[PDB]
Each structure stands twice: as structure tokens, then as C-alpha cells.
Design a protein around this ligand. Structure first.
Ligand SMILES: OC[C@@H](Nc1ncnc2[nH]ccc12)C1CCCC1
Ligand SMILES: [Cl-]
Length: 167
């Protein structure tokens, strides 16, 4: 039993809700919140910009030190950093950005990072400003993640479309 509330159950392990991931994280304070990161951990917009703003830029400060030490992530890769005031940990995961010409096949690799954590609050990877089809991202999530994932879909119209089209 966990403290996530109001989610629709899609499969044994995948759950979904129309919600602002920032507001959800502040309420639940989950062990792991997933950020829709880029390889430079530059949290400018989308989920990343919103999560970073909610940390008063502490996420960005921590991320800049991470990059200065380690260099950029790989597309499809991840790193674990602090969750600041939002969660215990933030799993920064880089899905492919179609608006950069990156290989959508890497979306499965990106979701595989979730399997290293028993429970996560997450957005749909590569959706929104990363330019992939959210219906496809949900299919990849369900077919790749085996741990317990609570998906927050900001857009209500998109949320309704994902449920009604879910196979
Ligand atoms: O990952 C892309 C995802 N974006 C967010 N998800 C959850 N919370 C969010 N807060 C700010 C942006 C954001 C899109 C939202 C509708 C479909 C995918
Ligand atoms: Cl977005």
C-alpha cells in the first residue's frame, strides 16, 4: 500500500492520472520522482523547467555540478540526484527528443531506467516538448517498466485520449 490517490489502473504495475507532476510530488513526497531531462541537465521547460522552478533552482545548481564532474548523460540514460523539496530522489531520465532528430527506438532504453526503482512518480517520456506521440510512449512504458509506476499526465484532454485509446 502506498499514498498515491485517484489513479486509474492500466496494468498490474502501471497507473495513470491527469495531474501536475509538481503538485503531485509536493503532496505525495514520493521516494522517486522522474524528470524528463536532457543530456546537459538544463532544466528550461516542460516537466524539467517546472520541477526545477519548484525547487527554487536548487535542482539546476546540483545538476550543473553533476555535469561539471561527469559530463553529459546519454540519450536513453539517467542519473539519480536529490529530490530536493519534492521527493527523496529525482531520477533524471533522457528520452529522445524528436525535435532534435533523435532515435525514437531509444525510448525503450530510457524507460528501462525505471526498473532500478521499486516505485516511481513519472511523466510520459519523450512526450510534450520532446515531440514524440504520447500514445506510443504509454505503450512503451507499459511494455518496458516492470516496477510500479504512477504516471502524471498534465493535459486533461490528452489524459482522456490516452485512457480511451489504451489497449
Ligand atoms: O513528458 C511530457 C508530458 N509533460 C508533463 N507531464 C506531467 N507533468 C508535467 N508538468 C509540466 C509538464 C508535464 C506531457 C503532458 C501530456 C502528455 C505528455
Ligand atoms: Cl512537456
Amino acid at each position: 500500500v502506498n499514498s498515491f490517490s485517484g489513479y486509474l489502473k492500466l496494468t498490474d504495475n502501471v497507473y495513470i492520472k491527469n495531474a501536475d507532476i509538481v503538485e503531485e510530488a509536493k503532496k505525495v513526497k514520493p521516494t522517486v520522482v522522474v524528470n524528463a531531462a536532457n543530456v546537459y541537465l538544463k532544466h528550461g521547460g516542460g516537466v524539467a523547467g517546472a520541477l526545477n522552478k519548484a525547487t527554487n533552482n536548487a535542482m539546476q545548481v546540483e545538476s550543473d555540478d553533476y555535469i561539471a564532474t561527469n559530463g553529459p548523460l546519454k540519450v536513453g540514460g539517467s542519473c539519480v540526484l536529490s529530490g530536493h523539496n519534492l521527493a527523496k530522489h529525482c531520477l533524471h531520465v533522457v528520452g529522445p527528443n524528436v525535435n532534435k532528430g533523435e532515435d525514437i527506438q531509444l525510448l525503450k532504453s530510457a524507460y528501462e531506467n525505471f526498473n532500478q526503482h521499486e516505485v516511481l512518480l513519472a511523466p510520459l517520456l519523450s512526450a510534450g516538448i520532446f515531440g514524440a506521440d504520447p500514445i506510443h510512449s504509454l505503450r512503451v512504458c507499459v511494455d518496458t517498466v516492470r516496477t510500479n509506476v504512477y504516471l502524471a499526465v498534465f493535459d486533461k484532454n490528452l489524459y482522456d485520449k490516452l485512457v480511451s485509446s489504451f489497449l
